[PDB]
Write a protein that binds this DNA or RNA. Structure first.
Ligand code: SF4
Length: 1119
DNA sequence: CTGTTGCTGC
DNA sequence: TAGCAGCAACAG
């Protein structure tokens, strides 16, 4: 009864969606009957209608499961069409001789929900000898809809649990493919993809290629301005919407609520650049309900198939929907928008493109630059208008024109952020990923890898693995593992200092490294022609000229091996390092074989070449307790009694063995933490064990073929990109002469390039995606250890011919002598020039001689299972630079460097890279950010090293004066701003219980002072100052929310008194509250790491005497 | 000395 | 629902 009721409820929701879709122009098109011969070559005679699939969703049709497909379509404004398809999954059998006994059992056991059954065959890469065409026999179960499929899973799961813990029932091994989403199933099984064009026909969807450009959907982008209380956040229960700003296809609009906005706003232009027009037409509406009705009316009129917002999943749409509910409007019946199971806002016809999702995932912006202004500055390259949130509600009455200018600025910023970056990126991803735009924007990158691998496995008739479930506990040497992993990317900080293209450095070249390079030179130059440039040496007219020029420079560096000359500042980095290690070594999770599976394989003979053995470094963190002590703790817990977690059970108490195995292990881990601390005084030993695994080269190539093929398609688009770049400049300059179609397609191929790029680097990660399928914790360890070995080999050469400064995973930063052999050009007989970078090609040659896979096997004849063996290697360094300067900081500790922080400057004086520093990080003490933001460029001043340290000393002394002067030389608003430290709490304050930190204390005090609403959401920005005047107290106990300094005087007083424990305090000036010694020590630290200690290591005497060296360093300097 | 956590690395 | 290595503040 409940399943019919649920199917009727789903049909009633599907009818409401059909009514809404028809209101928005998405009438359900059914194609004409065509009894002719189906050939996709004669598509124009083929019947029905061609369209580009813009939006797809799972539906229930008169219920039968189907997918509705929404076609921005060519020509048309839009039309939907439906594909019906039976939901299915598989049963696996342990004995293939008795499949018919299992078939009869499941027909009779699933009769209440099963539509049909069929025996099929699939390749299973875990089956012994599948590489001979042996396929696993499977029972396909098909259903009328997804609800009946879910009931069959509820009936089968008890049999699998009985079989695993304790007759044709015991022949059921597992259920396979039971957890594929239904729209993803239809998209894979029919090869239909959003962003791709299709002709909708009776037989299904036929992809079209004569059309690579996207259609132009109607794109709306909006933002909302709300009332708020002072120092608090707008509450949709009490606060009103003041204005809604939006853009539609490049026209601007503003709706204003005249209960709140004091004047009628006139039509105006906000064009922040000539490439971002914004003409705003104004709707001055009488009240908040007229504002909401106008907004819903205008959405129905223009029929947007995309609505974009900035963070509107979590502010804008929640606010509009709650205000609509207060006024008795149903936003779902008005415009088709509702919150989903995640609380994100979605419709059928229109995709919701929250730009903040792309900003968080894909923009590559650090979390400190992920707010709208900093995204606009970093992507659109202008400053939007900026208003203080505390001035918004006053300015609705005092200056509403300046509030409307701010609101239209955030609509313009959101619209052009969407159209220049999010739109081309997401629809390009949809052309390859079996997901709609909303899922393609919002799912994690490792889920996008899962979908691509599921397409490729399906196309090769491979059986999908079930999702990996982490074991609840594991043991190593009788110790309970807290966690296991591998040794990841290798990282070194070798030197610290300022390095400049115009300042001299000492070099001590190893003459034996130059002898190796002179002996390798002929084959390294041949390798650069044949492998890097894919040409033949016979075509190169000047090969011996370039060889002799490099030979002379090398001989001069061998004879004069101790030099003091200018540097060349270079970065050498491995192109797509982990993907290229994976393709080179044929690394997948489809091959890592045990000695058993390798022994069971008919290709395992004397002389076998196909078993490539590779090393990895496993890392345990396990409890110091042994298996006897674990068993003693388990026996102790078996005598205890536990509360029943299931509120629906009348049984309030359970024994240990009546708990779930996950709950048993949670209780074991708790008592083991106490026992380990009591007996061993310490908690998590860590150990690194080098392990070996067997990489099959003969195993079915579907994973690696996806990677090779994807890599080549990306290279393809980089090439096409370059050809298009030539096309965009070769031609005439009449910009409007039907060549703006050519430039959008340039953005498009760039976007498909960036798309394959993210997909590849993701495959590289996905493979450690806990809970994902095709997981391969090993494979990941081999990839990292192979990479660590490559980069240490490269460093060990660069250290012998120059000085490596920093090493991070795939990249080495180094200085070479300015006399070093650098860039050259080979001349072909056809007058074309090939590029040579000798510092790059000398590394690439050594990578190819040491890391090539001479065991790579590929299947030449699929009928006879004949494999060819060849030599594969795709691991190349690229070179970036040279540079004008590089500045590396040093640690406060003796003999230690700082990794992952540096600044680099281009020849033109501009900043090329800034890594890691507080300036870039979200949050952080603002004084430190403003400091770093002053100092780095000042390293380009002076003519000597000492003059350069002097110029930066002076900036240090300016900043030290501000703190020694206790800020007096500073405006009071500017002071609060500078001394503020801002830190995000990733959760809510409740979830931090028994922890301490400045954020926690700031949040608690904000709560007490401004109310519990302040801390109910996650992501709270805790802005605080550290207190103290002539005394002292605990750090995390001394964070004061800077907001208190804007409270009414009696409030401020009561709280600062509490927080400082001073009943009788009268002085409420921030300046007497602040702990100046704390801030001088934080700034001192920065000055040490970036300026004084590195100065010392370059033998320059303390350029900032007001900051004293630590003792070890003072001591260092005695002779 | 370790261990926790935020935001970066690359 | 991608991974590991690292800086550094603050507690113990
Ligand atoms: S190494 Fe050869 S014999 Fe062993 S599992 Fe792989 S393909 Fe089969």
């Amino acid at each position: 009864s409940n399943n019919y009721a649920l199917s009727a409820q789903q049909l009633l929701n599907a009818s409401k969606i059909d009514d809404i879709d028809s209101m928005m122009g998405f009438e359900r098109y059914v194609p004409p009957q065509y009894n002719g011969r189906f050939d996709a070559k004669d598509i124009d005679q083929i019947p029905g209608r061609v369209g580009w699939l813009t939006n797809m969703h799972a539906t229930l049709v008169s219920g039968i499961s189907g997918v509705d497909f929404y076609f921005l379509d060519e020509e048309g404004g839009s039309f939907k069409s439906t594909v019906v398809y039976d939901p299915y999954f598989f049963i696996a059998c342990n004995d293939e001789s008795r499949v018919n006994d299992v078939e009869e059992l499941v027909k009779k056991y699933l009769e209440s929900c099963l539509k049909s059954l069929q025996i099929i065959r699939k390749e299973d890469l875990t089956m012994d000898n599948h590489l001979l065409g042996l396929q696993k026999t499977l029972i396909k179960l098909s259903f009328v809809n997804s609800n009946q499929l879910f009931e069959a899973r509820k009936l089968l799961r008890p049999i699998l649990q009985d079989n695993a813990n304790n007759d044709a029932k015991h022949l059921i091994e597992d259920i396979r493919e039971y957890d594929v989403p239904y729209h993803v199933r239809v998209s894979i099984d029919k090869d239909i993809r959003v962003g791709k064009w299709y002709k909708v026909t009776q037989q299904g969807f036929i992809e079209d290629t004569r059309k690579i450009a996207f259609a132009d959907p109607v794109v709306m982008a909006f933002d909302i301005e709300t009332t708020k209380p002072p120092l608090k956040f707008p509450d949709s229960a009490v606060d009103q919407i003041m204005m809604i700003s939006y853009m539609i296809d490049g026209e601007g609009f503003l709706i204003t609520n005249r209960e709140i906005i004091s004047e009628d706003i006139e039509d105006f232009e906000y064009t922040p650049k000539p490439e971002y027009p914004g003409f705003f037409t104004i709707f001055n509406e009488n009240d908040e309900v007229a504002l909401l009705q106008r907004f819903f009316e205008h959405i129905r009129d223009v029929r947007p198939t995309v609505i974009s917002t900035f963070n509107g999943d979590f502010f804008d749409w929640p606010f509009i929907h709650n205000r609509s509910k207060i006024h008795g409007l149903d936003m779902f019946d008005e415009i088709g928008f509702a919150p989903d199971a995640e609380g994100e806002y979605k419709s059928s016809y229109c995709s919701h493109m929250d730009c903040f999702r792309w900003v968080k995932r894909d923009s590559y912006l650090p979390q400190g630059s992920q707010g709208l202004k900093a995204v606009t500055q970093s992507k659109l390259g202008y400053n939007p208008i900026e208003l203080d949130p505390e001035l918004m509600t006053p300015y609705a009455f005092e200056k509403p024109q300046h509030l409307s200018e701010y609101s239209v600025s955030d609509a313009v910023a959101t619209y052009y952020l969407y159209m220049k970056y999010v739109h081309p990126f997401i629809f390009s991803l949809c052309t390859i990923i079996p997901l709609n735009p909303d899922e393609t924007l919002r799912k994690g990158t490792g889920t996008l890898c899962e979908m691509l691998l599921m397409v490729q496995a399906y196309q090769h008739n491979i059986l999908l693995p079930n999702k990996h479930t982490d074991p609840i506990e594991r043991f190593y040497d009788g110790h309970l593992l807290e966690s296991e992993t591998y040794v990841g990317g290798h990282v070194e900080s070798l030197e610290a200092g300022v390095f400049r293209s115009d300042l001299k450095n000492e070099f001590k070249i190893d003459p034996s490294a130059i002898d190796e390079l002179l002996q390798e030179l002929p084959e390294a130059l041949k390798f650069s022609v044949e492998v890097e440039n894919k040409s033949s040496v016979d075509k190169v007219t000047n090969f011996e000229e370039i060889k002799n020029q490099i030979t002379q420079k090398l001989l001069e560096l061998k004879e004069n091996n101790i030099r003091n000359e200018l540097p060349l500042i270079y970065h050498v980095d491995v192109a797509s390092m982990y993907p290229n290690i994976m393709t080179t070594n044929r690394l997948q999770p489809d091959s890592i074989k045990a000695e058993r599976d390798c022994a069971s394989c008919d290709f395992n003979r004397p002389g076998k070449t196909c078993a490539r053995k590779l090393k990895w470094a496993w890392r345990g963190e396990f409890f110091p307790s042994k298996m006897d002590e674990y068993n003693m703790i388990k026996r102790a817990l078996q005598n205890e009694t536990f509360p029943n977690k299931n509120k629906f059970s009348k049984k309030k108490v359970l024994t240990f063995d009546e708990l779930s195995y996950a709950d048993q292990v949670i209780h074991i881990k708790k008592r083991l933490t106490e026992y380990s601390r009591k007996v061993y005084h310490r908690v998590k030993v860590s150990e690194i064990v080098e392990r070996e695994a067997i990489v099959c080269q003969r195993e079915n190539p579907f994973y690696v073929d996806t990677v090779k093929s994807f890599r080549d398609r990306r290279y393809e688009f980089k090439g096409l990109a370059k050809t298009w770049k030539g096309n965009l400049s070769k031609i005439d300059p009449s910009d409007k002469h039907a060549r703006d179609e050519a430039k959008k397609m340039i953005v498009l191929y760039d976007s498909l390039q960036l798309a394959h790029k993210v997909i590849l680097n993701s495959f590289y990660g996905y493979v450690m995606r806990k809970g994902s399928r095709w997981y391969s914790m090993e494979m990941a360890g081999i990839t990292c250890l192979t990479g660590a070995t490559i980069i240490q080999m490269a460093r060990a050469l660069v250290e012998r011919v120059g000085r490596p400064l920093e090493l991070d995973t795939d990249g080495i930063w180094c200085i070479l002598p300015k006399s070093f052999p650098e860039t050259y050009f080979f001349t072909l007989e056809n007058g074309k020039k090939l590029y040579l970078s000798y510092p790059c090609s000398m590394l690439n040659y050594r990578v190819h001689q040491k890391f090539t896979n001479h065991q790579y096997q590929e299947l030449k004849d699929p009928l006879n299972y004949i494999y060819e063996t060849h030599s594969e290697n795709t691991i190349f360094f690229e070179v970036d630079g040279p540079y004008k300067a590089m500045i590396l900081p040093s640690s406060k500790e003796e003999g230690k460097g700082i990794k992952k922080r540096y600044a680099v400057f281009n020849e033109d004086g501009s900043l090329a890279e800034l890594k890691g520093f507080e300036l870039k990080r979200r949050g952080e003490l603002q004084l430190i950010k403003n400091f770093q933001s002053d100092i780095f460029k000042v390293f380009l001043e002076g003519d000597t090293l000492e003059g350069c340290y002097s110029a930066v000393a002076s900036v240090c002394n300016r900043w030290l004066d501000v703190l020694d002067s206790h800020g007096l030389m500073l405006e009071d608003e500017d002071l609060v701003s500078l001394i503020c430290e801002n830190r995000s709490m990733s959760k809510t304050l409740k979830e931090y219980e028994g922890q301490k930190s400045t954020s926690i204390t700031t949040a608690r005090r904000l709560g007490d002072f401004l109310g519990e609403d302040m801390v109910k959401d996650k992501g709270l920005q805790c802005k605080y100052i550290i207190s103290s005047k002539p005394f002292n107290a605990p750090v995390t106990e001394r964070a004061i929310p800077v907001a208190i300094f804007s409270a009414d005087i009696p409030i401020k007083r009561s709280f600062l008194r509490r927080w400082t424990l001073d009943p009788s305090l009268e002085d409420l000036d921030i300046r007497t509250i602040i702990d100046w010694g704390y801030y001088r020590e934080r700034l001192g630290s920065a000055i040490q790491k970036i300026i004084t200690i590195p100065a010392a290591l370059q033998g320059v005497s303390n350029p900032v005497p007001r900051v004293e060296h630590p003792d070890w360093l003072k001591r260092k300097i005695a002779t």
